[PDB]
Amino acid sequence: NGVHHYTIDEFNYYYKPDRMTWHVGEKVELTIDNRSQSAPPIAHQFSIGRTLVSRDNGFPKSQAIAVGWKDNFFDGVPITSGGQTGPVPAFSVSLNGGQKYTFSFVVPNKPGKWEYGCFLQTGQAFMNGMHGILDILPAQ
Ligand SMILES: [Cu+]
Numbered sequence: 001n002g003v004h005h006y007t008i009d010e011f012n013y014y015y016k017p018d019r020m021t022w023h024v025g026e027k028v029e030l031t032i033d034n035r036s037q038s039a040p041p042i043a044h045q046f047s048i049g050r051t052l053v054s055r056d057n058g059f060p061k062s063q064a065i066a067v068g069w070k071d072n073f074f075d076g077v078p079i080t081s082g083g084q085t086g087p088v089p090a091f092s093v094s095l096n097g098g099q100k101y102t103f104s105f106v107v108p109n110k111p112g113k114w115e116y117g118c119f120l121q122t123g124q125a126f127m128n129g130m131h132g133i134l135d136i137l138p139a140q
Contacts, residue, residue, distance in 0.1 A: 003104065007031040008116070010044035010095070013128035015116065020132065022107045025139040029104040034095035041097020044125065045118040048073035048134055052115075054123075066123035073114050073134070080104045094120070111136045 004026055009016040010033065022028060032046045049069020074091035081103035093101050114134040118125035 003027045003029050005029045005031070007033060008046060008132075010034045010036065010046065010118070010130075012036055012038050012042060013118070013125050013130040015046075015130065015132045018132040019135075020116075021135045021137065023137050023139050024107050024109050024111055026107040027104065028107055029102060031100055031102040032093040032095060033100035034097055036097040038097075043094060043096050043120055044130070045120045046093040046095075046116055047091075047119070048114050048116045050114055063127050066117070066119055066126040068119045069115070069117070073108075073110065074105070077105050077108050107136060111138055 004022075006020060006028060008020070008030065034041070034044045036042050036044060047069060049072045051070035052064070053067045053070050054064035055067060072091060074088060076087050077091070078086055079088050079091065081101070093103075095101060112135075114136060115131055116134060117131040
């Protein structure tokens with residue numbers, strides 16, 4: 001019934017936590033915190049989606065160069081952050097080291113498995129394992 005607060009921390013090259021479960025209709029406040037530990041710290045991205053878009057050159061790859069999600073989880077989802085309210089097209093949280101960002105939303109009716117990932121560094125963060133699984137359940 002109330003606002004559920006989640007925090008996702010970013011490190012080189014992983015999210016804590018790397019798994020999260022929400023219910024359709026849940027009120028979520030989410031903090032994304034770039035805790036990049038390197039010297040210097042590196043920028044990290046948080047984007048939730050489905051259908052990995054990768055580069056192609058006609059030549060096969062043990063690892064696909066990730067560029068982003070085709071389907072964005074936040075497509076059409078009203079977001080509130082500071083004094084701003086409404087949907088954000090192509091919503092993504094990109095942060096330098098030491099920056100964080102908090103926003104809230106109601107979990108849209110998009111049940112099933114979504115992924116979160118970082119595509120900075122031409123997909124290198126992703127390819128080094130910077131991704132997580134979001135499971136969306138129907139409302140209780
Ligand atoms: Cu990253």
